[PDB]
Amino acid sequence: GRLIYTAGGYFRQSLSYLEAYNPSDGTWLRLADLQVPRSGLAGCVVGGLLYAVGGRNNSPDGNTDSSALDCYNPMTNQWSPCAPMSVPRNRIGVGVIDGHIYAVGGSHGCIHHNSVERYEPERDEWHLVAPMLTRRIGVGVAVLNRLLYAVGGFDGTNRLNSAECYYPERNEWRMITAMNTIRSGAGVCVLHNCIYAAGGYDGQDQLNSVERYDVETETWTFVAPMKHRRSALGITVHQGRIYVLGGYDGHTFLDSVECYDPDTDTWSEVTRMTSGRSGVGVAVT
């Protein structure tokens, strides 16, 4: 049995919720809180452990970006800290390649990162790699055939439809075809060997559109759009379907959870979170 875990988020302030959705019986399990309330973080799973990476503690008593890496074990229902990144990374993107975590982009105050670093769990160590070609906050990250894709984002002045790809062996980045739509804070995942980019913010509207990249044709194609436009959504793949959780539609913080079936190219609302939030980290384990 595998669950969809959501960690952190933002609703009037950063959150500590770790909750786990069961797509079969519909339940939400309330698990151990994060050590620190964080929003705009990213979630990943390595070796059956859930990692929460980066983010920002927004509190009524102050605001601070986060370089933190923390680790949750479903067998003990406990969190443990890890070694932190070199720099705080709010609205971060992450991906996993060969059991290594790649932290990508994000902001630290007024700094908009192009820097990227790699985490080795077997040694609890972080190391800088080659920086992206673009500074990207709110960047979507996906991993396709052991290649690391950074998609969209915001460079401090302009939001982006461009995308680049990191080759770890060469340790270098190369631009790829840009998306059809400028997207900041979109949900980016990999499903059945295509990269999906759903929602986000183009500087004027929150987006409901969804487009996917084929490496064969090197092309982005629109698919069915989501029911509710949303930016700063969480996104994950569970049993060959895409789940998008929460986000912000320009007025409210959503608790809606939508599900994409690629075989029908349809979206459907499957559950609601226990409370609306944006900027969560989500993963499956």
- Each domain of the chain, given as residue ranges in start order, spans 1-285
Distance CA 77, CA 13 (A): 24
Distance CA 185, CA 152 (A): 8
- Beta-bridge partner residues of 110: none
- Beta-bridge partner residues of 104: 93, 116
Cα→Cα distances 180→85, 183, 284, Å? 32, 9, 29
Cα→Cα distances 70→15, 36, 53, 148, Å? 15, 10, 7, 22
**Secondary structure of residue 100 in the 3-state scheme:** strand
How many H-runs (helices) and E-runs (strands) does the chain carry? 0, 28
Distance CA 152, CA 212 (A): 13
Is residue 263 exposed (0-12), middle (13-18) or buried (19+ Cβ within 10 Å)?
exposed
Q: Terminus-to-terminus CA distance in the chain, angstroms? A: 8
| CB contact set of 169 (below 8 Å; sequence gap of 6+) | none
Experimental approach: X-ray
Distance CA 154, CA 93 (A): 12
Tell me, in Å, the resolution of the deposited structure.
Answer: 2.4
Phi, psi of 265 (to 5 degrees): 50, 50
Distance CA 218, CA 85 (A): 32
Sign of the torsion formed by the C-alpha atoms of 136, 146, 197 and 182: positive
| CB contact set of 105 (below 8 Å; sequence gap of 6+) | 89, 91, 92, 93, 112, 113, 114, 115, 116, 132, 135, 136, 137, 138, 139, 150, 153
Q: Can you read off the two tokens belonging to residue 266?
A: 């349809």
CA 239 to chain centre: 18
Q: Which one, of 208, 201, 84, 100, lies nearest residue 146 by Cα?
A: 100
Is residue 120 exposed (0-12), middle (13-18) or buried (19+ Cβ within 10 Å)?
middle
- Helix (H) / strand (E) element for 53: namely strand 49-53
Q: Which one, of 112, 177, 120, lies nearest residue 138 by Cα?
A: 112
Provide the 10 A C-beta neighbour count for residue 47: 10
Distance CA 277, CA 232 (A): 9
Q: Which one, of 106, 95, 32, 25, lies nearest residue 7 by Cα?
A: 32
Distance CA 222, CA 203 (A): 20
Single-letter amino acid, residue 282: V
Provide the 10 A C-beta neighbour count for residue 113: 24
Q: Which one, of 237, 163, 140, lies nearest residue 193 by Cα?
A: 237
**Secondary structure of residue 222 in the 3-state scheme:** strand
| CB contact set of 129 (below 8 Å; sequence gap of 6+) | 102, 116, 117, 118, 166, 168, 171
